[PDB]
Symmetry: C2
Subunit: 133 residues, 2 copies
């Protein structure tokens, strides 16, 4: 069949490491790209194609309610276990994760068209910045 | 404002390595995710949240026409230059990337419910297998 439209998620990929070697990718990048999942989207018009591949590492879905404390299994990070309590401080969404590490929490808020996420653990502060899309 | 719905693409992310270090993520995993771009999708209903994150290492768009030759800048792989010519051999979509390396091309073909990808550079063959969705 020549009809290749649709979304195809990779399920097996072999000798990717070698194909990347003969292309002269550095070793650091190689031992990463083999951890990403790939997803192909092909749009076909007889013989006119528009296909976009995407290598996606891991992803977390957390669905909760503010004021409630709930169970967060930080799979895709360190699979640690915390008690997460979320509260508002003005317009800023603040969570603290009561558990193994101290100062494990985050802050998220909207300022114009960029969403600000601060991630803090220990004496480390991570600053994440997102523009809408 | 407390309204955080929408799709957020990260544009700057700093001290991610430090935040992850204090989480004791291993050095190999750390030196990876600092390459990932991150995309957040927030679903809000008053005080009830549904957040889904993603992390994207690299992404490629190649849009062409069979029989026609075009220039492919292999971003997301080695950011090299090839002239790519795509042709059918039956139900097998065949490309050759004439450029620096020998045998640089690929084969794509469908067998029912799965898409098969064969990737070759030089003497190395990568075989990828995808299921529809």
């Amino acid at each position: 069949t020549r009809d290749q439209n649709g979304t195809w998620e990779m399920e097996s990929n072999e000798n990717f490491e070698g194909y990347m070697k003969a292309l002269d990718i550095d070793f650091a990048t190689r031992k990463c790209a083999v951890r990403l999942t790939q997803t192909k989207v092909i749009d076909q018009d007889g013989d006119n194609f528009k296909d976009k591949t995407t290598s996606t590492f891991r992803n977390y879905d957390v669905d909760f309610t503010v004021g409630v404390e709930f169970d967060e299994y930080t799979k895709s990070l360190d699979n640690r276990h915390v008690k997460a309590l979320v509260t508002w401080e003005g317009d800023v969404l603040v969570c603290v994760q009561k558990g193994e590490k101290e100062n494990r929490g985050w802050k998220k808020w909207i300022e114009g068209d960029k969403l600000y996420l601060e991630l803090t653990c220990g004496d480390q502060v991570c600053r994440q910045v997102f523009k809408k899309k």
